[PDB]
Write a protein that binds this ligand. Sequence first.
Ligand SMILES: *C(=O)[C@H](C[C@@H]1CCCNC1=O)NC(=O)[C@H](CC(C)C)NC(=O)[C@H](Cc1ccccc1)NC(=O)/C=C/c1ccccc1
Ligand SMILES: *C(=O)[C@H](C[C@@H]1CCCNC1=O)NC(=O)[C@H](CC(C)C)NC(=O)[C@H](Cc1ccccc1)NC(=O)/C=C/c1ccccc1
Lengths: 303, 303
Amino acid sequence: SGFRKMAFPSGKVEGCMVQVTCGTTTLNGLWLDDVVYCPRHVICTSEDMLNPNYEDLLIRKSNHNFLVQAGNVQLRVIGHSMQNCVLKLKVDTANPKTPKYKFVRIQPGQTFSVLACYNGSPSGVYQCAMRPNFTIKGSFLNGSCGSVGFNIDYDCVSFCYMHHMELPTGVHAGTDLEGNFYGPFVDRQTAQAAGTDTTITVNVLAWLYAAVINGDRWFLNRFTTTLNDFNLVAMKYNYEPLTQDHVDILGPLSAQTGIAVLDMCASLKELLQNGMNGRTILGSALLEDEFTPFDVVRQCSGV
Amino acid sequence: SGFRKMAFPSGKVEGCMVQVTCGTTTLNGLWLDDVVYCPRHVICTSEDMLNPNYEDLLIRKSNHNFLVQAGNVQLRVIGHSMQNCVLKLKVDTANPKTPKYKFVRIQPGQTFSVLACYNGSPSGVYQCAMRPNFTIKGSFLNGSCGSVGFNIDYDCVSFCYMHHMELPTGVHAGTDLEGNFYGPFVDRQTAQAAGTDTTITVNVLAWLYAAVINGDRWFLNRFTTTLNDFNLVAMKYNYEPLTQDHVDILGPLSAQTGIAVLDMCASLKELLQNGMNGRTILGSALLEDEFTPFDVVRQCSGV
Ligand SMILES: *C(=O)[C@H](C[C@@H]1CCCNC1=O)NC(=O)[C@H](CC(C)C)NC(=O)[C@H](Cc1ccccc1)NC(=O)/C=C/c1ccccc1
Ligand SMILES: *C(=O)[C@H](C[C@@H]1CCCNC1=O)NC(=O)[C@H](CC(C)C)NC(=O)[C@H](Cc1ccccc1)NC(=O)/C=C/c1ccccc1
């Protein structure tokens, strides 16, 4: 028993982290085979933060402008290119620690582990969800760029996030590993706003099932609702619409607990309209939406 | 900026996990140099559970009754001994991945990272605190015994916890790596109940400082209190007494924010007496007590 915000074991990714310096700017790089991936804004100066044209800063760079350090071993850069908002630095050594890996782009509402690093050295690991507005609520300080997000399936690391920036609201924005930003953000010093966020309804339901599996039952009731009547309540509270595919995805948790999805929806509607009246669910006084149905099944395997 | 429950990178410990089987019972072991450490209840059977004489059970075992597997490689057990509630299995191979390490026993109120494992294979990593009643609120299923808790300083792994059991309340109990239980628990079958828990006051104050560092300021006030008057309120709400050493430990966070410790205590008193009136702090509607002052400093480093 127990339910915790759990990250994937980070060992396979730790072996991929290097330090990339260009000018007086240092950040993190991801070393896979003979390529190091890093945010392209490593080539920017104090003087070009509002109007940066990145082909040219790049055209004006040479291979020797990039110092790549793996531990205390210097890697020789033998080629450089831009891929959207990331740089690909070809180095003269394939990383012997390269895991089996994939570059996947994730969907809002999906979760991943972040390995926070500074100067190529990992600091900590934690779980994040991609918000409906394509930001993430992380923990990132100056020097955290090149910190990657990932999932692991058996021995294959699916990289999904590279960190680039913090917004004025304190939330975080980045790219997939092809260098394409999540959301309407750009790698400039512009104060940018994300759109309005919403709550990931299917995840809240999954976490309620986690609660039941773990013995928290006080919020259950006889009642059931229709999908239509639930979604009318959901939109009033800034919750995302629940689709039939969401209902289907919750099937296995529904079967394990014997609580029909639309029954659990009736509990959620009451929680939304009444609050908790001083009680907690799995140690929380708020409704939690950063656990996917997969996250619950993986962790609550067998109770 | 940002504040998350963050675990240490788990790579160094992943390289130490093995699978230990004796009879029909499989659990995890910790392989350091030429010794594998595991819970001694691996040698118990279905019908000796309520009070095994472990020491009778061990004299009846031989080296070949213990099968140890590191990945896909069987390790030969060449010796076995009991140290309190753990077993030391001497193997014929020193683990080439052994980090610099220490066996430390932690205090209630301190935190550590848990690498949850099954069949010698790591599943996830998360942060735990040792409760004042010597339990931990973890996520542990059947097969997770022998999973370890640890902190990392520089590149030295300080192991502090090995998992043994779940209490009827759903919380978890284990030993240090010398096999001595945290708290009044035994690796046998009784009606084991935790003693009454309390909230870790110094940690709540540390987390309030993290909140300020991260721009959550609504709970601040212009009052200050005396340590005596605060501790009278703390005792009323099941909070641990705040000592002058606690105030001293909070010094650096006090200086960084310019909020004197006893001023922050005045905010905490009002939070305890009024609640939050529907507001949140660092995304929480409850007062969080599983971040130490060190956890905050290390993460809210330089704003
Ligand atoms: C890379 O390591 C770094 C990480 C972020 C910086 C520190 C805070 N948390 C982080 O994750 N990424 C950047 O520095 C990035 C470089 C750009 C994309 C070229 N910039 C930022 O993240 C933010 C964007 C921003 C700009 C203006 C307002 C609000 C957000 N830049 C800053 O935070 C700097 C703000 C600043 C500096 C000096 C004086 C006043 C304000
Ligand atoms: C080792 O892997 C295992 C992990 C725990 C078991 C599964 C639940 N979560 C865990 O962390 N540790 C044990 O199995 C341990 C072995 C003892 C110490 C020799 N036992 C337990 O953790 C609990 C103790 C307990 C016993 C009775 C009531 C409450 C708690 N044992 C059980 O959970 C088994 C309960 C049970 C089994 C079969 C029928 C009815 C109840």
